[PDB]
A paper describes a structure:
Recently, we described the multi-step electron-transfer activity of a designed reaction center maquette protein (the RC maquette), which can assemble metal ions, tyrosine, a Zn tetrapyrrole, and heme into an electron-transport chain. The RC maquette integrates a Co or Fe porphyrin electron acceptor (A-site), a Zn porphyrin pigment (P-site), and an electron donating di-metal center and tyrosine (D-site) for photoactive charge separation. The RC maquette is composed of a cyt. b/b 6-like pigment/electron acceptor (P/A) module and a bacterioferritin-like electron donor (D) module. To fuse the electron donating di-metal/Tyr portion of the RC maquette to the pigment/electron acceptor domain, we joined the corresponding helices together to make an extended 7-nm long antiparallel four-helix bundle.
A complete understanding of cofactor binding requires consideration of the apo-state structure and its transition to the holo-state. Several Cd(II) ions are resolved in the structure, one of which effectively takes the place of the heme by coordinating the two A-site His residues as well as two water molecules. Only one of the two His-Thr pairs in the A-site forms a hydrogen bond in the heme-free structure, whereas both hydrogen bonds form when heme is present. These structural differences suggest that the cofactor binding site is only partially pre-organized prior to heme binding. Given that the a/d core of the RC maquette near the A-site includes two Gly, two His, and two Arg residues, all of which are likely to be strongly destabilizing in the apo-state, perhaps it is unsurprising that crystallization attempts without a stabilizing A-site ligand were unsuccessful.
Author numbering: 1 to 194
């Protein structure tokens, strides 16, 4: 348990804390965008005359209703990761300051917390990945019905879906980074608290 290994590990914990905060902020921005989208989608649907267009907007609406539930779950998984990370950093602060009473139980608790965050980040990544595949399909479907009666509202929809997909792709990239960081947090923690 070198001092350099302690510094690397605890720094990784702080990098991971900051990354999870940036992921959680992005998640809140995506939910705001989903809620705005579904307003503009429910309107344009009721404003659609062509059944070829009403059909497409209705399929998208059903997916957006599911996306709100999936995003609630995604954000909650992120919040749970943030709570366990607070508890992990606490456990490590105790391990560094204690001796004797404050040994195996706490060392195990540290590695248990790291493993649970690793599981939560996999759930969080999978939820985001499923929503993204849907948004790709929505851009393709909106592109097919572009131009006509409601072309103004359809334009404003496609534009929100294009800004939204960039944010979902960013969330998945940041999640890839977070998974790599928590793998390294776990492995350095094992080396320290073995």
């Amino acid at each position: 348990g070198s001092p350099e290994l302690r510094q690397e590990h605890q720094q990784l914990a702080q990098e991971f804390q900051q990354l999870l905060q940036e992921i959680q902020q992005l998640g809140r921005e995506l939910l705001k965008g989903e809620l705005q989208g579904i307003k503009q989608l429910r309107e344009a649907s009721e404003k659609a005359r062509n059944p070829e267009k009403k059909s497409v907007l209705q399929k998208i609406l059903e997916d957006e209703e599911k996306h709100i539930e999936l995003l609630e779950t995604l954000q909650q998984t992120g919040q749970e990761a943030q709570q366990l990370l607070q508890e992990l950093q606490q456990t490590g602060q105790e391990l560094w300051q204690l001796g004797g009473s404050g040994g195996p139980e706490l060392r195990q608790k540290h590695q248990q917390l790291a493993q649970k965050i690793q599981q939560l980040l996999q759930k969080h990544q999978q939820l985001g990945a499923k929503i993204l595949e849907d948004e790709e399909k929505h851009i393709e479907l909106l592109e097919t019905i572009l131009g006509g009666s409601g072309g103004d509202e359809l334009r404003e929809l496609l534009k929100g879906e294009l800004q939204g997909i960039k944010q979902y792709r960013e969330l998945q990239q940041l999640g890839q980074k977070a998974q790599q960081l928590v793998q390294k947090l776990q492995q350095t923690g094992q080396k320290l608290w073995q």
